[PDB]
Amino acid sequence: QQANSLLDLMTIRAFHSKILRRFSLGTAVGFRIRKGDLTDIPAILVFVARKVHKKWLNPAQCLPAILEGPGGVWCDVDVVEFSQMFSELVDKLCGSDECIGSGSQVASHETFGTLGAIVKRRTGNKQVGFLTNRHVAVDLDYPNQKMFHPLPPNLGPGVYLGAVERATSFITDDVWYGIYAGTNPETFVRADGAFIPFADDFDISTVTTVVRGVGDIGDVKVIDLQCPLNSLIGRQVCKVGRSSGHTTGTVMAYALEYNDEKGICFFTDILVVGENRQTFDLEGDSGSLIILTSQDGEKPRPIGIIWGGTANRGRLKLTSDHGPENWTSGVDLGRLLDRLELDII
Amino acid sequence: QQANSLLDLMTIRAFHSKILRRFSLGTAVGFRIRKGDLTDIPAILVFVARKVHKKWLNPAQCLPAILEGPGGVWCDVDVVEFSQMFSELVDKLCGSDECIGSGSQVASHETFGTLGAIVKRRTGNKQVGFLTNRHVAVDLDYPNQKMFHPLPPNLGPGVYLGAVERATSFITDDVWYGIYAGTNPETFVRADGAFIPFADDFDISTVTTVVRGVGDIGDVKVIDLQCPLNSLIGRQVCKVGRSSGHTTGTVMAYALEYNDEKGICFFTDILVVGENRQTFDLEGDSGSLIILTSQDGEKPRPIGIIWGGTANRGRLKLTSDHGPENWTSGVDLGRLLDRLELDIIITN
Amino acid sequence: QANSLLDLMTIRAFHSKILRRFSLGTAVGFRIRKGDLTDIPAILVFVARKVHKKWLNPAQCLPAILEGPGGVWCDVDVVEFSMFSELVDKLCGSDECIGSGSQVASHETFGTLGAIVKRRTGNKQVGFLTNRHVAVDLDYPNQKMFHPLPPNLGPGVYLGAVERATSFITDDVWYGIYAGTNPETFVRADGAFIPFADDFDISTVTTVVRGVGDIGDVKVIDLQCPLNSLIGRQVCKVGRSSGHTTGTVMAYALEYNDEKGICFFTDILVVGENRQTFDLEGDSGSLIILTSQDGEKPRPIGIIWGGTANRGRLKLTSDHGPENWTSGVDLGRLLDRLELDII
Ligand SMILES: Nc1ncnc2c1ncn2[C@@H]1O[C@H](COP(=O)(O)OP(=O)(O)OP(=O)(O)O)[C@@H](O)[C@H]1O
Ligand SMILES: Nc1ncnc2c1ncn2[C@@H]1O[C@H](COP(=O)(O)OP(=O)(O)OP(=O)(O)O)[C@@H](O)[C@H]1O
């Protein structure tokens, strides 16, 4: 039987992980892509440095057309080559907006990013704070730092938001996905989540729960691994960022697996690409909510958060008379909330 | 009574200099700017590093909307954000023209600039030469620097034009404006002018008094502090430079004040901003004449000279769905001519 | 007169508003006259340049004597503030056994082994103590260490992974008393305990110090003890790059303000002898052992924080050039906080 859900593709990739990684830079699951378009045939996306004809390729590097795993499940094999706009919304999010909400710029003493969303703690005092990344919100040298908006007191005027309380660095793949997606013993998944509660003296009347440029949003869309592939992969999503305004894109790959220079395996949740030849995100967009758009009038639903700028890692080069495109990685929102024990307002 | 002259604005700025200086990057006087459009309400413009809502500013950090001066004069406050064209005219001014005049390129041993205008010495033996900025006209090590056009012989073919006779860099505010512009003694306005006379063997038949791309010009328009603000602020000007060609802009503020790292106050006379989101000038345009646009068919008249490119200092970022716009600083022509004792030439 | 370090600390804290205007740092100890240590207790003040009093306005002229809330008075000392050998080769990885001062290389940086220790509670695992700057990389909280080089850079063996570490501690908890009018007061602990791997061979670990010998128990620093017990005492250290070196303790409870206004505290200040540098780069984490007196076994007193070549040097004004200084963290308080006992 052909693969239908993400779990089958993940199992197939894990079973033949060695062969896929033997002559490749990365692996993921999704739909087969032909001539730059997304089809409806489930398959495994294999990233290579360059694309060449089979004539100049030895049989060792000739990847099999079909990969078959336990239980009779089989899938196709796809080899893919791998290598501040001034607007009213951007100005408002940069310090021109009276209220504070999603997409607002949050600057630390050293780095800056985009405000993720307003959340509340499930247990304890149930303090209301905001959720963001961990590479910008908190510097590793100082575990507990402060938050300033728009800028700290040394760079310019600003107000104090709060201090970092709970943050996550890495999580074992078993805890995150619930299944073993890799044979290497030290498999990790990046969360890059942190919660900063609002200060006691901070006014709460200036906090808004409406996302600028999108409008009202629904409940968090939990990505169930048993759901059909077409449910999540290929759906058009939108994002709001301080330096990128409002952007739209489409998701192509999920659970991208790669290895660093030290051989440690790492996983990325969501892989998306901007639409109409436009880059999905830019520098300073760390902390932008990826939201699945409205369908049949239903309220848009956040599904994840952008990890950060991918321009420093690589680009997706298309082989159909087109230049390389910019891909953006993502981090799951439901699993991050579950780990952080937070509820989105 | 609402102030309507530059003198009142200068008095208000000087009387409350400390308050503005405490949390400002610069001060000027002119017309209030709302949503990127100049208004008719006179106000003192205060320049800040960034613009934020008043809710995230301390009570001492909030500049008052209005201020009062001696005798009952009151004025508003406007906070403003602060942070080679290949053409036939440019080619001709580069050294391919049949005559040398305003806008021509003058190159020293090290740097280059644009000829200001042909002038005549009021006193002495009625020497005839030209006016330009002091920075490029004279080398800091050689008080008497030679002039070449279009390039010095060490860098390319050219002819000798003359030698620097007199130059001025800084002058006390009392002598320049006639009034005390601040509560600082060590206050000096930057004239940055030099008079370079033509060589005895140089041919005067090749000197023309007609500005290329504009036409004939009239007498220098002296700026009076008692005149209405609308006379100078908000008017349209045009300039010709050897690098940017012909460029049109608008005057936005007067008597800009700046503080250096050492704490020495400095003053700039004319503040210009380009039109249609186009830079007023670029590097190498220093010394280009600023000419007020003709009105009701009147002959255009120069109002000042251009100090140089501002790209090495900063830009003002408009907060209306647009990016930073380049601005230019200039020095009053009439006061510089009076100090240097020079007379402009407008006819052959 | 101030006889204990606590009196000097209280005096400095009470008047910590006039010495911070025109000073780069403050500490306590003995007044220095003509380049030599005196016996008069005083508070050391660090200035960029030691100009003459005549060319100094009265506002910038600091008082020479201060009085505390209990009648204690102390003077003011103003000091201007700005190898290939067999032992080194053996310590670099040529020794059959590991021990104090041994080179330990991580995936990014390398450092010196502080001392072999054990945990008081729990499994009481046996490991070693070092600095977090080298042993711990925060973009990889659990890092691996190899001696003398990591596999990617050369031959080596697996030692273990960092389990517990401390970077900053509140001043009240560390010293026990409020040392500053500032609440964002922090003290740089910089101590990480790495336990030996289960498969690691424990027969190759020695508690003897190369170039020094056997050492006794850790000598805890008591703020109530006379300054002579700690200030002006000779100390020695063994570093991977600097071999065996000796120096003298100069200052205690040094305070420094960063560019962001956050104050930080360093415990021990040491200076090399004979105009020789106390330590070089890569010697961070080396133990500081008090010189043996009257035949008593040497007792370590702290751990070197790191090289000061990137932080400045002590400039003297007696026909001599600047002398490099070294910063250290008290061993007793760090061990108490981290619950570790030196074997
Ligand atoms: N290791 C490799 N190095 C270089 N080129 C390779 C390597 N492995 C495969 N290729 C080339 O990449 C091709 C992958 O084809 P794939 O199945 O991904 O695409 P397709 O659906 O046939 O069409 P399209 O080219 O439009 O994507 C292989 O046929 C071979 O030409
Ligand atoms: N020191 C300061 N730093 C930053 N922002 C400031 C400072 N002082 C005032 N502001 C902000 O700048 C605003 C000044 O507005 P301005 O004087 O330009 O009036 P306006 O013409 O009504 O405004 P606009 O140009 O936005 O149409 C103040 O209302 C406050 O929001």
Ligand SMILES: Nc1ncnc2c1ncn2[C@@H]1O[C@H](COP(=O)(O)OP(=O)(O)OP(=O)(O)O)[C@@H](O)[C@H]1O
């Ligand atoms: N803020 C300052 N900046 C520069 N120099 C200063 C400052 N305050 C004091 N001084 C100078 O430093 C001297 C401090 O001398 P100090 O306290 O070390 O006495 P001393 O031990 O007798 O002197 P010495 O070390 O020269 O033998 C003051 O007498 C004055 O000359």
